[PDB]
Design a protein around this nucleic acid. Structure first.
Ligand SMILES: O=C(NCc1c(F)cc(F)cc1F)c1cn2c(c(O)c1=O)C(=O)N1[C@H]3CC[C@H](C3)O[C@@H]1C2
Ligand SMILES: [Cl-]
Ligand SMILES: [Mg+2]
Ligand SMILES: [Mg+2]
Ligand SMILES: [Zn+2]
Ligand SMILES: [Zn+2]
Ligand SMILES: [Zn+2]
Lengths: 252, 270, 69, 47, 48
DNA sequence: AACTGGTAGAGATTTTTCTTAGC
DNA sequence: GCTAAGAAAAATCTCTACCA
DNA sequence: AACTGGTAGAGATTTTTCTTAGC
DNA sequence: GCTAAGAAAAATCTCTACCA
């Protein structure tokens, strides 16, 4: 156990590993490995989208793209007012978690209706990838145009072929697998951070061997079934449970 | 004896239609005879068997239905294993708009199985052509039995309660529909893992892909075949693939079927 | 000759006593009870019956299956 | 139903005076009514 | 075979052995919620 | 401040009764 | 003659639809 | 021959956590 | 310093209406 913590600290001092790899290699819990990463001075987005409008056959196609994965959602608009752009943004924010929207300085994007939608759904709008996505979508649309009667069917068939049928990148994944893996990794991070804060609201008085007195207040990191890991004096150490007292702390 | 009582009980049931306890007490026949007299009458037998079944909950199954609100037509689709909702307002209840809603849904999320009722928009050639092109299995419920798709009708109820909660913050009904979808998907927690519906659909689909890749890498380097003895007759079946050897039993795969066999009836050969 | 007819009558007795069931079901928009039909397949939740040379699927909650002694 | 079996077994015991296990296996009636058919005959006895 | 195919095959087989022993525990770190017969509540977290 | 769901049947599970073979 | 295995017949327990 | 009720909230009961007095 | 009573806060279990 403590040998695993010592090997993890020496290996991070050499190579600066991440906490998932250290927890899987050295067989330590994840809160301990995250503390080892968080104590290092040299070691201290999944919700950003971009939007644009374009033209095809006299129609208006609005395109939104998830940036870290390349994931496309598109639609055909009857006009280019601010109310239709606000309805598209409200549908997108109701289906995927959107926190940061990046657009250009168009007219319909600089509007009171889009501003009211961003106020209600709590999005950060920023005015200045989508050009490459418009070119790629237009090549697929021309590649499958003879199978559809209307332009709306061809647009949605091209979105399906782009998202699930084209493979590339490092491991040969599509865009849907990449967006799902990215958001799932972020969810794991936030749940572990909630556990970390709830544990770190405590305090530990511990008694070393060959002494009767209690030492200073060390902060609890992990409380197991038979052992207790504490941080004290910028040092992580493992004390048995029969030489410890854990009390609540009020130091806000 | 009671054989004359059997004859009088048959005449009595032919006139009055007694239940079995009345005949078994008034004619002093055994209860099996009285139950048979009642069971051979067609004017009786008006009662079901009092149980419920259980719908399909595979990780790529969706259910779809339509509802009405303030003179409009809403169309609701639910992901069954997680509870994830998509919804829209249709200008008409035809088959063209239903085919376009299904095409957009199949472009956004992976759909392989769809369950619907027998309305005129879901049994249509446009929805048939979209399911053919996008490779979906479309199944229909038993007619006039809404319990076969209980998840989407329960979500009709939840959507209407949220819409009445936030009705005064919007002007039109399409705005209030999309605000209700956001509040259901992301602002309500509680359930299997303490998740919301968006977190649950992310966890379910990511877990599906991860576990296929892991057991592909495990099974591509396996060995230690197992010959096992099972059945009513003590025969011996051929090459089976050992998957996991445990404290008490082993797990084998035979002809693409999973089986759990104890250690006394199997022999491992490297 | 006689013993073969004894074996044939025994096997036909077991075959006839396996699956001679009657089904009273309830179907339609106005859910009325209808006459006896022949059971074909019985799964958990629903059954498939043959009535008047027509196959129908009824749930097990809307049908009664009568066996023989 | 076995009600026609009860009538047929009564005719058959009136001819040949069967026992009760024979009638209960041949005519597929329950054992209580077959024992009662043997009990009502003044010449036979259930054994 | 030449030398490059030999060195690639050797390191690949060694990696497959050690990663097998880790991947089994990795696949057993999932949790399953299941349903038995004629009971309509989802039973607790068994292990896959 | 003084009001309110219930009835009966279809199967499943547990218990009692009855015949017969073995020691 | 006494005892126990096996099966038949009876008793109890849980669950469902319909009543404007 | 291959079909099927479910979702989420209001209380009641059981369990875990936290402070303080007594020996 | 150690132990137990008491109460607060959290976790589990049973039951209901509505969905054309
Ligand atoms: O009675 C309904 N719901 C209430 C309810 C429930 F949801 C779940 C339950 F367990 C019990 C319930 F009483 C209901 C009725 N119908 C339709 C519905 O979708 C629907 O939900 C529907 O679409 N059709 C189309 C197909 C043929 C035509 C048009 O008649 C039917 C009527
Ligand atoms: Cl229907
Ligand atoms: Mg419907
Ligand atoms: Mg419905
Ligand atoms: Zn570092
Ligand atoms: Zn009757
Ligand atoms: Zn006689």
């Amino acid at each position: 156990f403590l040998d695993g913590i010592e090997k993890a600290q020496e290996e991070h001092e050499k190579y600066h590993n991440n906490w998932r790899a250290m927890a899987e290699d050295f067989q330590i819990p994840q809160v301990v490995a995250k503390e080892i990463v968080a104590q290092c001075p040299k070691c201290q987005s999944p919700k950003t989208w971009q939007m644009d409008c374009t033209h095809l056959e006299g129609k208006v196609i609005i395109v939104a793209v998830h940036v870290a994965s390349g994931y496309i959602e598109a639609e055909v608009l009857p006009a280019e007012t601010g109310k239709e752009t606000a309805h598209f943004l409200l549908k997108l924010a109701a289906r995927w978690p959107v926190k940061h929207l990046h657009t250009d300085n168009g007219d319909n994007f600089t509007s009171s209706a889009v501003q009211a939608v961003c106020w209600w759904a709590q999005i950060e709008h920023t005015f200045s990838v989508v050009e490459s996505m418009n070119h790629q979508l237009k090549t697929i649309i021309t590649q499958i145009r003879d199978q559809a009667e209307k332009i709306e069917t061809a647009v949605q068939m091209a979105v399906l072929i782009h998202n699930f049928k084209r493979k590339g990148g490092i491991g040969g994944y599509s865009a849907g697998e990449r967006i799902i893996d990215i958001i799932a990794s972020d969810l794991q991070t936030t749940k572990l951070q909630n556990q970390i804060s709830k544990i770190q609201n405590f305090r530990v008085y511990f008694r070393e061997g060959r002494d009767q007195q209690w030492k200073g207040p060390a902060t609890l990191i992990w409380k197991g079934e038979g052992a207790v890991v504490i941080q004290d004096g910028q040092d992580l150490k493992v004390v048995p449970r029969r030489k410890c007292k854990i009390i609540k702390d009020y130091g806000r």
